[PDB]
Each structure stands twice: as structure tokens, then as C-alpha cells.
Nucleic acid binder design. Structure first.
Lengths: 51, 51, 17
RNA sequence: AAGCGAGAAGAACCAGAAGACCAGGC
């Protein structure tokens, strides 16, 4: 089976949680570098396109 | 001055000019009073953590 | 004389410092 | 047997008392 609406449902906050858990006990700067992307994606915007 | 096999490959006047320039900078720096400061050089203060 | 027929692995060692 | 991106080193770098006296262990 495939997963219906997989991309539409993979929330970026959960990705932030996974990164923060994975980067446990790591240097704070490393945690920052890994966690920035989920933060930005959680606040992402989608261009509509040509029109 | 002193070189390998006592060969300086330079005219006496050129080496004299170099040594005089060195002596002059030495006397100017001593006039500034940091001659003893130049006599100190630490191994390395390398503690730049990645932030 | 002394020779290795077939040497696998990377070899060496970081212990020597 | 393993095998899925790159490196190398500019400049130059220790201190004496001695003497007297007293106490003390052996």
C-alpha cells in the first residue's frame, strides 16, 4: 500500500520533534542547525503560480 | 647575520642596509617600550567554539 | 622474503600517537 | 574481505651571606 495524502499530512512540527529527540545531548549549535529547517517549513508559504 | 656555509649571496652594502633597517625598527619599538612584549609569544589561545 | 599473500582490511592503527 | 565527493602548515620559541650566641636530639 501507499499512504493517502502522505505529503499533505506529514506535519513539520512532528519533524521538529523528531530532530530535537535525535539531537538530544548534542551541542546546542548542532541542535539549532538541524531544527531550523522544520521551523521554517512550519511557517512556510506557497506561491500560487502563473494565475 | 649568518647563513648556511657562510654564504650570503648579497653585496656587503645590501646586507648592511637590511641589518640597519632591523636595528632601526628595534630602536623605534624600544622607544615604544614594547620590546619586552615582543619577547613573549604563547603557543595558541585557540578556543573558538562553533556557535 | 617475508611477504603477505593477501592483506584485507584498511590496516594501520590510530593508537600510535 | 570490504569498497559510493575534498587537505598540511606563514612568521618564530640563579642565586651564596658569614659570624656569633642560645636551645635541642643523638
Amino acid at each position: 500500500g501507499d499512504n493517502t495524502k502522505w505529503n499533505e499530512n506529514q506535519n513539520p512540527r512532528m519533524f521538529l520533534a523528531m530532530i530535537t529527540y535525535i539531537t538530544r545531548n548534542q551541542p546546542e549549535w548542532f541542535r539549532n542547525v538541524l531544527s531550523i529547517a522544520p521551523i521554517m517549513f512550519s511557517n512556510k508559504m506557497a506561491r500560487l503560480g502563473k494565475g | 647575520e649568518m647563513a648556511t656555509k657562510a654564504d650570503y649571496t648579497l653585496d656587503e652594502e645590501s646586507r648592511a642596509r637590511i641589518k640597519t633597517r632591523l636595528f632601526t625598527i628595534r630602536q623605534e619599538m624600544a622607544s615604544r617600550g614594547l620590546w619586552d612584549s615582543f619577547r613573549q609569544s604563547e603557543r595558541g589561545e585557540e578556543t573558538i567554539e562553533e556557535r | 622474503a617475508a611477504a603477505a599473500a593477501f592483506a584485507a582490511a584498511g590496516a594501520a592503527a590510530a593508537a600510535a600517537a
